[PDB]
Write a protein that binds this ligand. Structure first.
Ligand SMILES: Nc1ncnc2c1ncn2[C@@H]1O[C@H](COP(=O)(O)O)[C@@H](OP(=O)(O)O)[C@H]1O
Ligand SMILES: CCN(CC)CCNc1ccc(CO)c2sc3ccccc3c(=O)c12
Length: 246
């Protein structure tokens, strides 16, 4: 098993649905931030080391390739942060892998991002998200790795993450840069709602018969997840309320 598809889309662009769609197509696992959170929190420090490497005057690209290869062993595809920030390195490692860019309206994206993964520091909802996440074992080391991967994707050392104007411009620039860097023949831009047809044609497979394209990980469900984690203090006690997520 080797990487066949590199997902370059940012969080809140349908990455979890795309992860599930690729798992349906290939019958093998796809990487996602939820793999780290729910299955392999030991990966956090490894990702942090690779992101740290990118800051050096000369990044040891072979150290990065080797670390990515180890992290992705057993997976057929990648989506989401932190992996999407390494899409160029993955393209070099896997010259036959195709690239997907999941994308959506930038204002819809910003609202989703602020509600679920990156609230403003002045938003009281941030404390609720953090309290729920603590139930999952998430701590400051996870948030540092995730923020660092986002800053790496946006190519910035210093960025005011609390400024919506900055985030909107970074989102547009990131998506533009993917389209400039990946040759069009190697890239599929998949807009929220596009479903199976373009994806299956791009990957040389048939449309899965009787299986609908996934629609996972809505902000409504995520807000409920935070609320129920806070209320019950146990993932296992609430997982029956959240089918089709992990
Ligand atoms: N098949 C589909 N059709 C429409 N929206 C979808 C979808 N699959 C996922 N989404 C939306 O993609 C976002 C989740 O992305 P990610 O998995 O990258 O975090 C959520 O947006 P909202 O927060 O606006 O509901 C979710 O509703
Ligand atoms: C109930 C919600 N909880 C658990 C699911 C959110 C857990 N947190 C995250 C989950 C998924 C993703 C990307 O998919 C990110 S990305 C990011 C990027 C920058 C800073 C933080 C984050 C971040 O904290 C996060």
């Amino acid at each position: 098993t080797t990487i066949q598809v590199i997902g370059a889309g940012l969080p809140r662009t349908g990455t979890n649905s795309m992860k599930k769609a690729l798992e349906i197509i290939y019958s093998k696992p796809c990487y996602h931030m939820y793999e780290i959170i729910f299955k392999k929190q030991s990966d956090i420090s490894i990702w942090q080391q690779l992101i740290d490497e990118t800051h050096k005057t000369t990044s040891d690209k072979r150290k990065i390739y080797n670390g990515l290869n180890e992290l992705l062993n057993g997976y057929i595809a990648t989506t989401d942060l932190p992996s999407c920030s390494f899409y160029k390195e993955l393209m070099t490692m896997y010259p036959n892998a195709k690239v997907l860019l999941t994308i959506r309206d930038k204002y819809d994206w910003l609202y989703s991002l602020r509600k679920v993964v990156l609230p403003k520091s002045t938003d009281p909802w941030k404390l609720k998200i953090e309290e729920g996440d603590q139930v999952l074992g998430i701590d400051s080391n996870f948030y540092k790795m995730s923020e660092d991967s986002l800053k790496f994707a946006f190519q910035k050392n210093h960025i005011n993450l609390d400024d919506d104007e900055i985030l909107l411009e970074c989102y547009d620039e990131y998506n533009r840069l993917v389209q400039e860097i990946v040759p069009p023949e190697r890239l599929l831009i998949h807009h929220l709602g596009d479903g199976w047809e373009s994806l299956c044609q791009f990957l040389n497979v048939d449309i899965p018969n009787g299986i609908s394209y996934p629609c996972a990980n809505s902000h409504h469900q995520m807000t409920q997840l935070t609320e129920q984690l806070i209320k019950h203090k146990s993932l296992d006690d609430i997982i029956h309320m959240f089918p089709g997520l992990i």
